[PDB]
Structures are given as C-alpha cells and as structure tokens.
Amino acid sequence: VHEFAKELDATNISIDKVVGAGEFGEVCSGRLKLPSKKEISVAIKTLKVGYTEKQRRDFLGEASIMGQFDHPNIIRLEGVVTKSKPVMIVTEYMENGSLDSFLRKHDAQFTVIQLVGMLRGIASGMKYLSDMGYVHRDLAARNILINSNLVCKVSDFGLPIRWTSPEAIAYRKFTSASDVWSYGIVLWEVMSYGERPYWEMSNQDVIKAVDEGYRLPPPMDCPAALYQLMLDCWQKDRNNRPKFEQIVSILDKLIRNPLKIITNLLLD
Ligand SMILES: Cc1cn(-c2cc(C(=O)Nc3ccc(C)c(NC(=O)c4ccno4)c3)cc(C(F)(F)F)c2)cn1
C-alpha cells in the first residue's frame, strides 16, 4: 500500500460529519492538515471495527489502486491511516456528491454546455485510466463525484448489468472498450438528469434487448450530436466504438458551442 499511498498522521485529520447516508460506504467529511500546514477538506472512509484480515487487505488494495492515478478528473487519494485505528482512506472532498443523485435534484436546470463540461471531465479521467491499463468495470453516474465547481471525477464505491457491454455480460470480455460502452450509458444518465438506465426492466430483458440491437432512446431535448455519441459508444462490435481520446476530442469540439440540432427502447 505504501508504494502508492502516503501514511497520514491521525493528528492531522479532523472529522466533521457523516456524509452520503451510506451511499459511499462508511464515509465522513473532515479536514486534513498537509505538511506545508495548508488545511484542505477531505472525505474519510473508515474500515469497520472488527474487520477480518481479508477485509483489511481488500481495503488497503483499494487505496493502492487509487494511489496510482494522479489526474484532475480521477478522485485524488490524499493518503491512508494504517498505523492507528480506525484504518482510513482519505480523499479530496467532493461537495456535490454522486453525479446521479446531484442531477436528480436539478432536473432540466443546467445548460447543455454545463452538462457537456461534466461529460468531458469524466471522459478525460477515463482516457487516463485507460492509458494506464486500468479497466474500471463499473463506470456509472453513481460512481462519478462532482465538486463545488461542477468538476466531475471518476470514483468507485463498489457494488452491474445496466452499465455492462454485451460482450462483458456474455463472456466477461472486459476491456477499455467495454468501459467506453459504460461511458455511453453515463452519457445517457447525464443527459437524462439521473434517470436509471433501462428504468426497472428485468435484468434478463436488459440483456436480451441490448443483444437484439435495442438501445436507450434519446433523452428529452438531447442534441443529435450527443445521442449519436451514445450510439457510437454502444456499437455491438467493440472495435467500432471510439477510444476515450476521441470521445474527449468530440466533446471539446461541442464545448466550442457549434448542438442546436435536437434528435420504449429503440431498435438501433
Ligand atoms: C475495490 C476497489 C475500488 N477501487 C477504486 C476506488 C475508488 C474510490 O473512489 N475510492 C474512494 C475511497 C475513499 C473515499 C473517501 C472516496 N471518496 C469518497 O467517498 C467521497 C465522497 C465525497 N467526496 O469523496 C473514494 C476509485 C477508483 C478509480 F476508479 F478511480 F480508480 C477505484 C479500486 N479497488
């Protein structure tokens, strides 16, 4: 763990309050005093009292993964506490919480360009994870955190049929291209302001429908460019899906605001 995670001194951590009502795990917000004496807001996940050795190993392995990724759109590991208990993982604080729950509070209240900025941040984080050989496997709006300035950052709270590509469902073929499929689902979630993908369809029907070529329909008022981007991410042939670098490039062009062309499952 210490290869990729700094050991924090518990005397530098103050705990404020419980956050997220369990959605992130056993997580609090608080402050961390850095070696330079600067104090920053942080999220703190604690390992349960009475943990088993496997639970500790799994907890510290998580920190080890996170510590590998230093990027503006991937959740930043500040460090771990292992030499005292409770054992902790400390990250930057993301004031606006998970993106799906945030958007549900704000239905139709953001501009298209604001939503595209969110989407671009997520794609940039994924471009770095993929460049680093990391396949996320659970890329979903609930695993994206959003801060006070609406910057979105790839996270993972653990457990996902609705977000999984057909090949990863069929025979566990997980690649960065199956993450691109997942990104198309997140793109739909964002444009739908946190609607659940495939709503409450039976999992077996989500699997069969997608395999038969059916896809989620355009969100209300969804620009054609963005719906086409979803369809491109949802290509049956993983080789035909765009790479994350190309997704970032697409969004960067839309950010220049060229987009006013507007578009149960659709046979696509
Ligand atoms: C089992 C496992 C999970 N992960 C993993 C966890 C996480 C992650 O986000 N973990 C995590 C751990 C501790 C905390 C405190 C947080 N942050 C928050 O819960 C949070 C809430 C609000 N602000 O921050 C987040 C991220 C990544 C990713 F994709 F970015 F590479 C991977 C790796 N292995």
The domain ranges of the chain are: 1-94, 95-268
Per-residue exposure over 125-164, b if at least 16 CB sit within 10 Å of its own CB, e if not: bbbbbbeeebebbbbbbbbbbbbeeeebbbbbbeeeebbb
Helix (H, G, I), strand (E, B) or coil at 259: coil
CA–chain centroid gap for 118, Å, is 11
Beta-bridge partners for 223: 262
The three-class DSSP label of residue 89 is strand
Enter the resolution in angstroms.
1.8
The structure tokens listed for 6 are 């700094």
Q: How far apart are CA 208 and CA 214, in angstroms?
A: 9
**Neighbouring residues of 46: CB distance < 8 A, sequence distance ≥ 6:** 26, 27, 28, 86, 87, 88
The CATH class of 95-268 is mainly alpha
Distance between CA 54 and CA 117 in Å, rounded?
39
Would strands 77-81 and 88-92 be described as parallel, antiparallel, or unpaired? antiparallel
Asked if 1-94 and 95-268 have one fold, the answer is: no
CB atoms within 10 A of CB 255: 14
Instruction: Answer whether 102's CB lies under 8 Å from 220's CB.
Output: no
Contact 183, 123 (CB under 8 A): yes
**Residue whose CA is closest, atom 20 of ligand 1?**
43
* Residue 112 Cα to ligand 1 middle (Å): 28
70, 124, 73: which is closest to 249 by C-alpha? Answer: 124
Method by which the coordinates were obtained: X-ray
Q: Is 4 annotated as a binding residue?
A: no
In angstroms, what CA-CA distances link 139 with 56, 128, 161? 24, 14, 11
As a dihedral over the C-alpha atoms of residue 171, residue 172, residue 174, residue 180, rounded to 10 degrees, the angle is 70
5 Cα: distance to centroid of ligand 1 (angstroms): 13
Enzyme catalytic residues:
138
Question: What residue ranges line ligand 1, CB within 6 angstroms?
Answer: 24, 27, 43-45, 62, 65-66, 69, 74-75, 89, 91, 93-94, 136, 145, 154-156, 158
Domain 1-94 coded CATH 3.30.70.3280 = no
Strand partners, 44: 28, 90
* Ligand 1: centre distance to CA 75 (Å): 7
Residue spans of beta strands (DSSP E) within the chain: 13-18, 27-33, 39-46, 77-81, 88-92, 144-146, 152-154, 214-215, 266-267
User: Looking at 142-259, which runs of residues are DSSP E strands?
Assistant: 144-146, 152-154, 214-215
